[PDB]
Amino acid sequence: HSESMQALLHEVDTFADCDTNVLLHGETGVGKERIAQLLHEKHSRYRHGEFVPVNCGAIPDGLFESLFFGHAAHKGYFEQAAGGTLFLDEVGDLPLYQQVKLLRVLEDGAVLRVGATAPVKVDFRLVAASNKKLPQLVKEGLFRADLYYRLAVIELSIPSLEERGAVDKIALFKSFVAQVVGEERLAELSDLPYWLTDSVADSYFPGNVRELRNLAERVGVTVRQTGGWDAARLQRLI
Ligand SMILES: Nc1nc2c(ncn2[C@@H]2O[C@H](COP(=O)(O)OP(=O)(O)OP(=O)(O)O)[C@@H](O)[C@H]2O)c(=O)[nH]1
Ligand SMILES: [Mg+2]
Structure with missing residues (x-):
């Protein structure tokens, strides 16, 4: 590999095995999902759950609720990533309302299945990825500052070819x-x-x-x- 990849994989070695949220940066097709799968399988606990990939830019507004929270029957992505890793690709493509529902799941640690009355706890590692300048989207009010400061903790930059x-x-x-x-x-x-x-x-x-x-x-x-x-x-x- 090149120097860029060796530095990146060194970051992965440092930061894989812990519960902190990760934000991956990089152009389309640089291998961001592969890196998230690395982080998943190098986590000592979450490696045993499912790896659940989600493209936030191909979810229609009519189905966001069903696809993420499930139904009382469908299992949503949050519950599918129980004991595992949720990969949120194109997180910058989420609409503001869906950004707020995501941040409320992340803060309260539970989801309400659609058609249910009791919320259920959820535990997963969050790896989100974007190809956009999220801070500048926040300055324009296209991305919520609360979600960003909750997501952008461990930041990794994946080099282009x-x-x-x-x-x-x-x-x-x-x-x-x-x-x-x-x-x-x-x-x-x-x-x-x-x-x-x-x-x-x-x-x-x-x-x-x-x-x-x-x-x-x-x-x-x-x-x-x-x-x-x-x-x-x-x-x-x-
Ligand atoms: N062997 C090998 N395959 C790689 C490497 N980087 C990427 N790939 C592969 O190239 C493809 C890239 O797809 P992803 O990893 O999903 O790409 P991505 O960056 O998430 O793309 P977006 O969805 O547009 O954000 C996959 O088939 C990867 O397994 C690498 O360093 N080595
Ligand atoms: Mg992908």
Whole structure:
């Protein structure tokens, strides 16, 4: 890995095993959910519960209540993350009202299942992630200051691929390709063409590691289904 990743994983080593809330920063596809899964499985207690991922930017207002609090039957995300870790991706995309309901769950430590009269305690580790400048959203009143100061305790910054550099881009590409083709079959084929890795290293990935994994999956499947490195087929993919 590069220096950015080693520093980041060092932060993870320091801060994984404790109950404090974590806020992850980074562009789309840098690997924020992977980091949250790391934090989950390096927690000594919460590792035994479920990892519950939630994209707050794909929840329609009509279903927020059902999806988060459940029904008296449906189990919401809070109760699904009992003894585990809740990953709140795109937390900045929450509307203000849903921000307030979340902060009230976080402060009181309980949820009311829709259609119930007694609230039920809840215990989970909170990892939230955003790709936006949350403090500046708070200055504009698009994000609530109470929720922010409750979320933004352990802050981690996940580097982009352009920050990680060409050596890390090429190593990620190669391990993804090897995972798609099989290291043993890769051994029985020609070497990976140099123009391919050069092209990878000199390309900008807006989608960061998601986009790069997609490219390596297309490459690996082409190789797997044709039995070699077709330069026309591969060239089409760049
Ligand atoms: N091997 C490996 N895979 C990685 C690494 N970083 C990211 N990935 C993978 O690349 C993809 C990135 O997806 P996520 O981790 O969910 O990305 P994200 O940053 O949460 O994206 P957003 O949902 O847009 O915030 C996944 O398939 C990850 O497992 C890395 O350092 N090593
Ligand atoms: Mg995600």
